[PDB]
């Protein structure tokens, strides 16, 4: 019933003192439905998902003015933060941010996110009271005091409540048919012998929407987790996810395991045997 | 400074069937930072025509990217992906496994 | 719609 | 200028069955749904019906599964009732749609269905009664006279059929309403010393309804004549000939005669030489 | 526009 | 019970050398509707051929259109190799240029 | 801020029916094409803000188009004639038109010209109600071009239809129709020998493609030892250039490359590393 | 939008 | 009247070995319009090779973009060999990225 829209932005130097490759992405759920790429010759926020390409000349305007004005300040900081820490003129760095809210059901502001890292770590996150900074050690201490003096929070904040959930019911309205559907997971069963004495059974799921799955293995009715892998949830490249589980078992015994498989497009949970 | 590995899977977008044209996917995820080498080979040369998704990263900062391209399995061809990192000494070769 | 408010860092 | 829409479903059983619905307009054919083809969806197949939004691919996409389903099953009790091999495979396919005129009203509709590419059951011209193949058609025929399936398969040929026939042929005014003539030249092939053939060619043409014949000193042509079924070109166009065996030296006494709705006037070709 | 009332045949 | 396919091999413009043309392989007539259909080239199996989604005739019968992107040549041979369950070995049509 | 349309027609004489192509142009960018070969033979979308038009729009822009080639083709049989020009030998007509707008919107300037051959043949004058001819037959089409008041309705148009519908494209494809991509811009060195080397100034990636290079040597205009090769397109909508200066050896920092191009704040002055 | 007064040459 | 195509040979970016690129051969101020223009891969012709919609300019020369995608090797060769009726026999000129 809750909805999520994020924003992923990645600033990263290029080696001698080149001007930095900058990427953006937004997703609503686990559908991206926008990118900007500094490298392009577009230079412009370009529509990803067919129900974002109704927004007119205005839009993408303003949101290409947007996220260049981030980039190049990003693009300053990674240089100062070079300073700051001494990093060698031959070496890449990274500044990242992620940030948007989330929805309820009526459409109401739920939570909000706002963060950055750089080269790989936390630097500064708003937190939940969407009021405070947790801020790492060193130079996002400056920054902190920085935001804090500027009362960037307050401006953040009137994003996250505001604009970023009145934009995403715009877009979960406008592209209801993909982004309020949920496809269910297609399950099949594979058996893979390893030895005289052992196989390998491994419970399929494709195809499924969104992302959120749980797949399990129980013997004899009770929850069995030794022997047991996992693969991470991958996209299949169609908008849709996949994932398996795998357990290893002695040769004869197949019949006392069983998998779980629990997604919400399905009506109730699934059971696979082999 | 803080470097992370990839994950690596190489897989089809539909199960694989001798003949039927498919998708062959390279999906790399939990690495840091984000510039990488990735390539679909088959029988061991590189693939030419590969798309790959726009750079995006997780909760935990690590990037991920789907690369992808037009194949049709066989019986006799074999597939997989190439990557190189900055975190890899050389380059990490997984092979298409159409049971995975 | 992205955020318009753009904070230096340093 | 009339026009029709027609759509073609095939389920085949696999020793779950591969289904396929293909929609025309004319010669046109304007939408697909694969079951091989994952993210199982109406598809467009022609650059008119791409403005038709999200939720039209919604409910095309749910009313063409709902069908395949019930093929499926239907492939399942034809097995069991002809006790058809587990390991083989057979095949149900229907086949519907509506013509209107040129004054966008109904004039006909159609409902048919085959089995194992035999006639099983269609709806007959009144719309009201149907015609069964024997054995288990007849139980259909029977079941469908006592739910009114009739009833509901003429409200949709004469309803919404007609309904968005009417609204393709205004979107897609620019391709469907449109005449391309063909383009016709002959071919001289020596197939002796004593003897020849002419051939007549038509391409570039839509629709693909055409009528090729050949004449000698202005009278029909039948023997020693070869015709071959019009092609498709890939490009939406299609293509036909017609050849006619002649004595050497007599080419010139054989025209051909080409009609075509997209010809003012009906062609006539004569070997050149 | 497809047809939406299915008729099963058996 | 069962029909063997038609078969016509031709171009989707009229042939020269040197100019890229499309080769289209046009099987029609045929049931059941499972078929294999390859555009040989010198005898080798050409491997880019898409084809058309599968439809029928008022008789039931399935008909599919198999092409592929070509450029004609003087020396080059090219054909449309088609098997179904009524055919025991695979029928090879060869592309005429005037045909 | 000032902007143009332009079309492009060329004829083709064949050794049979004329091959006739045609472009349409705002500024730089292309946005429609036919090609008589093509199997539609209507006027074709090749920019993504001209899809948008209607059917009354691409019946009418078809329409016209072919009218013109049409008579295009017939006067390339009279040049023929009139000329005593061989059968197999091929000929060319095209026309070039259009019209230029200000930063109002308003109508600046406008063309309609012809060339048989490669060659001027007739021209309208700026003022838009006199005609240049070349020789012969030429003269033959000023006169009847005159009679006929020709250039009355060719100002129309320029004036007219050619100036509403630029400004309502460069509306609707704003987004990339009124951009400026500022070039991208790097110096390399490639030595001649012991005494001369050469300075290549490079501009990438840029659009429109008006764009100025020039060198000074201290602050001087040089004009000597100087290379422009012609500006090319990257295929991407942006266009590529380059300027070349051939300098003596140890004296390659005395030289500046200028760079002047409507994307560019101020203009550029690059100078060897 | 194409010219639509189309001049014979000759 | 009759004017000799000029050539240049060029990528679409600047060429990086083993990234996919696009390769470009841009033929201009020539007359009449036929022209015959091939893209070379090692001397043999590339398939793939499409072209731009025959335009002008404003001296009544034509001119027209050749182009395929491509992946610049360090070994491998690139070419566009252009023949026109003004030419005594095809014209080969060879990709240098610089
Ligand atoms: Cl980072
Ligand atoms: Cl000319
Ligand atoms: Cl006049
Ligand atoms: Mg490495
Ligand atoms: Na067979
Ligand atoms: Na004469
Ligand atoms: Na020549």
Known sequence: GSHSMRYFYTSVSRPGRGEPRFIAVGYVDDTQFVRFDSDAASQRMEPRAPWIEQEGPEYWDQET???????????????????????????????????????????????????????????????????????????????????????????????????????????????KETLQRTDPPKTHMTHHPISDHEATLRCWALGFYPAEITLTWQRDGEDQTQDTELVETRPAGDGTFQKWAAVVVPSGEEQRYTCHVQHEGLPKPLTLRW | MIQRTPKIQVYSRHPAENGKSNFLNCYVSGFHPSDIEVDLLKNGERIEKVEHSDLSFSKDWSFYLLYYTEFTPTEKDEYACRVNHVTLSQPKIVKWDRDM | SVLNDIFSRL
């Open chain 1, 65 to 175: 003015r947007n996220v260049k004005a981030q980039s190049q300040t990003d693009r300053v900081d990674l240089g100062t933060l070079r300073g700051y820490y001494n990093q060698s003129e031959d070496g890449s760095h990274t500044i990242q941010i992620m940030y948007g809210c989330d929805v309820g059901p009526d459409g109401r502001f739920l939570r909000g996110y706002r963060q950055d890292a750089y080269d790989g770590k936390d630097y500064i996150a708003l937190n939940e009271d969407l009021r405070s900074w947790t801020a790492a050690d060193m130079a996002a201490q400056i920054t902190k005091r920085k935001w804090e003096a500027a009362h960037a929070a307050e401006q953040q904040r009137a994003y996250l409540e505001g604009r970023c959930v009145e934009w995403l019911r715009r877009y979960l309205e406008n592209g």
